[PDB]
Amino acid sequence: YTQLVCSYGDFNMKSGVYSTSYYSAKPVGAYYEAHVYPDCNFTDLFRENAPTIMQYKRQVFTRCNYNLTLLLSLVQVDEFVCDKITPEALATGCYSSLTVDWFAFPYAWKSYLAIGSADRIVRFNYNQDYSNPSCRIHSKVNSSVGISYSGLYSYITNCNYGGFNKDDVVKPGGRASQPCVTGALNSPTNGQVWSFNFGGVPYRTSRLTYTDHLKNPLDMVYVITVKYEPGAETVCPKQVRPDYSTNITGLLGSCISYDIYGITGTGVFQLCNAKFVYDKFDNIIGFHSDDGNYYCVAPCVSVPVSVIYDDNTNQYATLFGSVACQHISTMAAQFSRETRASLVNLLQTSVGCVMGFHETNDTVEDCNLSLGQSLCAIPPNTNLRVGRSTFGLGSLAYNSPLRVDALNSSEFKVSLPLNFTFGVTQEYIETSIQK
Amino acid sequence: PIDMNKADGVIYPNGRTYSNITLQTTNLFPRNGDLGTQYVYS
Amino acid sequence: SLLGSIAGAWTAGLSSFAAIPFAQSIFYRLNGVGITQQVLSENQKIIANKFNQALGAMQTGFTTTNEAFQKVQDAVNTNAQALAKLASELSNTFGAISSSIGDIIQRLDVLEQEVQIDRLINGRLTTLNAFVAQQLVRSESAARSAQLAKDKVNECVKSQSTRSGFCGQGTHIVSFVINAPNGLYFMHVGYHPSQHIEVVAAYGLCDAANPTNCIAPVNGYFIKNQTTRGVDDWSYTGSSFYAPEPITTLNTRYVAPQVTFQNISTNLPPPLL
Amino acid sequence: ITVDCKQYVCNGFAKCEKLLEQYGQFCSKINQALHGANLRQDDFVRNLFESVKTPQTVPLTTGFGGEFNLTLLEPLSVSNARSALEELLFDKVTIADPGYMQGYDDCMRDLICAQYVAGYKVLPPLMDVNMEAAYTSSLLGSIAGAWTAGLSSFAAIPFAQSIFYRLNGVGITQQVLSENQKIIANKFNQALGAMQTGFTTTNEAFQKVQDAVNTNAQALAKLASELSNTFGAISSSIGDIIQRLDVLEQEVQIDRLINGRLTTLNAFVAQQLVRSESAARSAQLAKDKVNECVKSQSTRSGFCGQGTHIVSFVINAPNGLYFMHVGYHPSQHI
Amino acid sequence: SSIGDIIQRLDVLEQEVQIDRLINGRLTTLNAFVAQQLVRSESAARSAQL
Ligand SMILES: *[C@@H]1O[C@H](CO)[C@@H](O[C@@H]2O[C@H](CO)[C@@H](O)[C@H](O)[C@H]2NC(C)=O)[C@H](O)[C@H]1NC(C)=O
Ligand SMILES: *[C@@H]1O[C@H](CO)[C@@H](O)[C@H](O)[C@H]1NC(C)=O
Ligand SMILES: *[C@@H]1O[C@H](CO)[C@@H](O)[C@H](O)[C@H]1NC(C)=O
Ligand SMILES: *[C@@H]1O[C@H](CO)[C@@H](O)[C@H](O)[C@H]1NC(C)=O
Ligand SMILES: *[C@@H]1O[C@H](CO)[C@@H](O)[C@H](O)[C@H]1NC(C)=O
Ligand SMILES: *[C@@H]1O[C@H](CO)[C@@H](O)[C@H](O)[C@H]1NC(C)=O
Ligand SMILES: *[C@@H]1O[C@H](CO)[C@@H](O)[C@H](O)[C@H]1NC(C)=O
Ligand SMILES: *[C@@H]1O[C@H](CO)[C@@H](O)[C@H](O)[C@H]1NC(C)=O
Ligand SMILES: *[C@@H]1O[C@H](CO)[C@@H](O)[C@H](O)[C@H]1NC(C)=O
């Protein structure tokens, strides 16, 4: 009754059969599942010589387990700029792949290396891609971590080519082309344009250094890009969620929270006959776990519960539409508190399972509590104040015609009135609406 | 020539498996009717 | 004015008006549906009493068991709900920090104010569009129902329908109309048999001695073995009330002979003698 | 259709359920709008079958039509409460099984199993198939006897006699009917019995039954499919938003996703209402035809079909009634 | 109102937000158009019958 009242927002509803929402289908317990692989070895990020921006390093991590705390515990974060991801989430999600780009770069120049800019820093050296969720981390790395910064650190300031002086601009996610790197590495550090041929094409390139801006705590840029391709996660965290189980069997037949290969939410799991199984509306309806078992997945709200209510007696009964009554006991945990207790009785009807009804051969003339398929609820004659009582499970009356049989004659029977009454058929026709 | 009615040269999506559906995709595909370059070894 | 035109609305054409008493109109309306004049004359007090019962019953009829009545209240409630939606949806905060423009302006800077106000505007435009679209859907509904009301005024009230179902259940006699909130309330008085008798009827009768001379009943039946109950006992009854009477030329028509017509010798009806 | 709005929109997520309060009592309004629309559909049925309902009938037996073959119209239980044509019509129209009884258990087709995922339910009709069939069966048995002024009496007249009087009443003399009575019965039987092979792609009335079915399916496809949409959000999944973004962007992203799901539900309710008005009009038409084409002989041109109207029959159809009007059509003139 | 103006003025992230705002409005217009044509089709069905 309370679910009915809250679903409609009305304490004084009329009699009828109403669908209702669930107000007690809360999760109890949780299940976590993820792939286990060798660690995503990140040594190359911290224990080598820092890359330049014109020749930055990239490493793509697949089929491994990562530890983001390990990357961050080694560095002093100056700033981070994340897009469609947060450092908090970056640390715990599963990805089809994880990509890290990195190079030495002055913190003072972080505005050059920025989303709306189109400076030479971006045009000829590093052009961040934004098609995938990513985060640009500006951090200071201490020499105690093994980071070094020998040699010249430089960026390309120009790289036009051909007779039209066409700027060989770097495309998002790309890098300076081999002709530009070849040129710039042979260019003077005073920013002067050097001309050379690369194969059959003339190039004019120039560079500037930033070596003088690099100090003992080394200003580094690490850009972490994560790809999400549901069903193809190969990269997962080493850390398992603190309150989640890693064995689902003790959680079957119950509404739980879950995190399965990056897919989260609540639902009810059942062991079924045979990594994610989808319907035609992109819903996950089952999965193959790593212990070999296949499970079905349903929302914690899967049974189309409706309430039959009589506002004269304030009596009510429940229909679990289209559900066989055997399955109702097992789903008791997701129903209202008083339904759950009552299930811990039921009649099977052609429209579903009904609770709070008794069988009756009585029929109904005006059926204001139709259940469907010629079934009608027949209200109790006792008010709720006395106590709860059941509804008759009856049917819509078929008031058959008089049967006048024909004669195998040249004559026929006719039924004529002997008496008669007058009756008034009342009808309302709405002819206009409020203006 | 590439025959689109046989899905010649079509690269399957790299995520989930799709079944008994039609999917609208913009991606790297061959052109229908395209004659590629033939190479011969002996 | 419509009530005052019912009794007089008689002949072909809509040009004339007859200032006929209501009671006379009812008796002709009953005769026109198969109740003979002898019956109407004998039962005229009974007819008036039953009619009065049926009609006067409406004084206590506007209750929760009266579907036509509840339908009036529902039309009223429907209009109220449409307005509830304009009045209530103003309080919504459509992704904004507040439903109040004033609260947005005094809390956020000039750039976020534009975003937040636009969110709030979009929701209020949506509400108005939804309102107009339903009024239009409800206008089409009214156009259809207004058309129906016109047909019933012209066919049930200003005349006597012979159409089944239309103008109510049973045999239609007379309709009345009063105004209702947002429309019209129709009250159709019909004739409803309460008890029946089954008798045997002929398709027609022929003179056995003169087989080309055959008759058929008009607005009734030729029924057998009801009066005197001897040889070749045939009599006429109105089709809407069992009341056997002698077969006369006022109850019959001459017809072509048929294989299903009875051939009678004795107590031959006057139309056949 | 009824919809569990709260489940449809938030899919069990508490943060969404809280944000949803900023749209007012949205779900309460949806629940009441759908409840109202569904009650109207039941009233259309109650009134339609008030017209189908007969005071008196002559019980159907085999050979009901006499010289006229009405076997395809009589109930199988005479020769199932449903006739051979009505079973044939229902078997040639492709309809997904709603699973009204234990349908939940079977899913543990896609627009039906989507009910228990998406958060919506297809409701059963007021009457079952037997009861509706009983009404049309009784209607068939009242045609021959439905003769004189007034609707008070009933004549248990053989079908064949009713046809001959119906033909006489439209200008065919008795000598003609007597000489050609075998010819009339044979032509009638040809025309009517032809329907056994009539439910094909060239039959517009039939294809119209399938289209009504397809229309209902499309409405549900829109509830089931639009949940997968990502309405400017990073994901269609609330869970993906919560686990990827911080607490402030989550509210913006969830609101984007909610707004789209509220829009879908509003669009659904508005069409059901437009389609309810359509049904109100068509239900009215069906009542007029039952009372004017079947229970009587129309003299109105066009109404009750082409040519001169003689007799109509009615069987049930998915979402409505199927009328078969037998008319008299001259084939050669002088 | 111009997609081209959005692309040439904003960066790649705000372009998606701004284009989505513009798309949502254009989808709304098309949905409103279809819904009225359907309401007007029902009107015509009734009048054609008349
Ligand atoms: C992820 O990496 C962190 C290091 O950043 C690990 O935490 C360290 O654990 C060792 C013991 O093995 C302690 O001595 C260190 O003091 C810890 N360091 C910090 C910063 O906490 C953490 O255990 C790793 N996670 C997993 C699942 O292996
Ligand atoms: C990690 O990579 C470094 C090279 O950068 C290599 O020397 C080291 O042995 C690797 N460690 C593991 C456990 O693979
Ligand atoms: C930085 O590295 C130096 C040299 O190894 C070490 O002495 C110092 O403790 C480190 N400081 C920090 C903050 O890690
Ligand atoms: C899960 O726990 C059950 C005991 O409750 C045990 O029998 C089963 O083997 C465990 N499964 C795994 C994968 O550990
Ligand atoms: C209804 O009638 C049937 C007839 O067989 C009987 O078996 C059944 O017990 C009756 N039920 C009730 C509730 O009267
Ligand atoms: C007709 O029915 C009424 C009500 O039962 C009764 O009072 C009256 O005497 C009856 N008359 C006949 C003709 O049976
Ligand atoms: C006429 O009615 C009487 C009285 O009921 C009955 O005994 C007699 O057999 C009937 N005769 C015929 C031909 O029906
Ligand atoms: C009455 O006589 C006519 C003419 O002989 C015949 O055609 C018809 O079948 C007879 N009908 C009956 C009821 O005997
Ligand atoms: C009557 O029609 C049925 C088909 O519905 C056919 O099987 C039967 O043979 C026909 N009978 C006659 C006498 O034509």
PDB file of N, CA and C in Angstrom, chain A residues 23 31 72 86 125 136 151 154 180 198 241 249-250 271 273 282 331 429:
ATOM      1  N   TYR A  23      10.421   0.350  -3.503  1.00  0.00           N
ATOM      2  CA  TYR A  23      11.079   1.228  -2.548  1.00  0.00           C
ATOM      3  C   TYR A  23      11.966   0.559  -1.499  1.00  0.00           C
ATOM      4  N   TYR A  31      30.010  -7.755  -5.233  1.00  0.00           N
ATOM      5  CA  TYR A  31      30.934  -8.647  -5.926  1.00  0.00           C
ATOM      6  C   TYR A  31      31.844  -7.933  -6.924  1.00  0.00           C
ATOM      7  N   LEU A  72      52.229   8.039  -8.829  1.00  0.00           N
ATOM      8  CA  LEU A  72      52.025   9.306  -8.163  1.00  0.00           C
ATOM      9  C   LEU A  72      52.852   9.446  -6.891  1.00  0.00           C
ATOM     10  N   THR A  86      38.916  11.279 -13.875  1.00  0.00           N
ATOM     11  CA  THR A  86      39.552  11.948 -12.746  1.00  0.00           C
ATOM     12  C   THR A  86      40.688  11.052 -12.296  1.00  0.00           C
ATOM     13  N   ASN A 125      55.172  19.815 -32.118  1.00  0.00           N
ATOM     14  CA  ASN A 125      55.774  18.891 -31.168  1.00  0.00           C
ATOM     15  C   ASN A 125      54.757  17.950 -30.547  1.00  0.00           C
ATOM     16  N   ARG A 136      46.462  15.060 -18.272  1.00  0.00           N
ATOM     17  CA  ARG A 136      47.805  15.600 -18.373  1.00  0.00           C
ATOM     18  C   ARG A 136      48.322  16.008 -17.010  1.00  0.00           C
ATOM     19  N   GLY A 151      71.844  15.904 -21.940  1.00  0.00           N
ATOM     20  CA  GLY A 151      71.695  16.235 -23.356  1.00  0.00           C
ATOM     21  C   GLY A 151      70.920  17.528 -23.568  1.00  0.00           C
ATOM     22  N   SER A 154      64.891  20.180 -26.477  1.00  0.00           N
ATOM     23  CA  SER A 154      64.441  21.123 -27.472  1.00  0.00           C
ATOM     24  C   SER A 154      63.081  20.817 -28.032  1.00  0.00           C
ATOM     25  N   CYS A 180      61.095  16.452 -39.878  1.00  0.00           N
ATOM     26  CA  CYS A 180      61.139  17.562 -38.923  1.00  0.00           C
ATOM     27  C   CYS A 180      62.144  17.285 -37.824  1.00  0.00           C
ATOM     28  N   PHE A 198      65.120  16.349 -47.645  1.00  0.00           N
ATOM     29  CA  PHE A 198      64.823  15.039 -47.096  1.00  0.00           C
ATOM     30  C   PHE A 198      64.252  14.218 -48.232  1.00  0.00           C
ATOM     31  N   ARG A 241      38.573  -3.701  -4.844  1.00  0.00           N
ATOM     32  CA  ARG A 241      37.680  -2.853  -4.036  1.00  0.00           C
ATOM     33  C   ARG A 241      37.546  -3.412  -2.577  1.00  0.00           C
ATOM     34  N   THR A 249      29.366 -16.946  -5.276  1.00  0.00           N
ATOM     35  CA  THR A 249      28.380 -17.990  -5.008  1.00  0.00           C
ATOM     36  C   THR A 249      27.568 -17.704  -3.760  1.00  0.00           C
ATOM     37  N   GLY A 250      28.179 -17.061  -2.776  1.00  0.00           N
ATOM     38  CA  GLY A 250      27.482 -16.773  -1.529  1.00  0.00           C
ATOM     39  C   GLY A 250      26.534 -15.589  -1.679  1.00  0.00           C
ATOM     40  N   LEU A 271      22.821 -18.572 -11.218  1.00  0.00           N
ATOM     41  CA  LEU A 271      23.631 -19.485 -12.013  1.00  0.00           C
ATOM     42  C   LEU A 271      22.758 -20.023 -13.153  1.00  0.00           C
ATOM     43  N   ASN A 273      22.625 -21.768 -17.509  1.00  0.00           N
ATOM     44  CA  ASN A 273      23.280 -22.525 -18.562  1.00  0.00           C
ATOM     45  C   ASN A 273      23.806 -21.568 -19.632  1.00  0.00           C
ATOM     46  N   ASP A 282      21.318  -3.241 -25.874  1.00  0.00           N
ATOM     47  CA  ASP A 282      22.618  -3.076 -25.240  1.00  0.00           C
ATOM     48  C   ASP A 282      22.605  -3.228 -23.726  1.00  0.00           C
ATOM     49  N   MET A 331      12.491 -14.347  -4.657  1.00  0.00           N
ATOM     50  CA  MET A 331      12.709 -12.941  -4.941  1.00  0.00           C
ATOM     51  C   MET A 331      12.187 -12.066  -3.810  1.00  0.00           C
ATOM     52  N   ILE A 429     -21.245  13.911 -23.405  1.00  0.00           N
ATOM     53  CA  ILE A 429     -20.349  14.212 -24.500  1.00  0.00           C
ATOM     54  C   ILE A 429     -19.634  15.527 -24.251  1.00  0.00           C
TER      55      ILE A 429
END
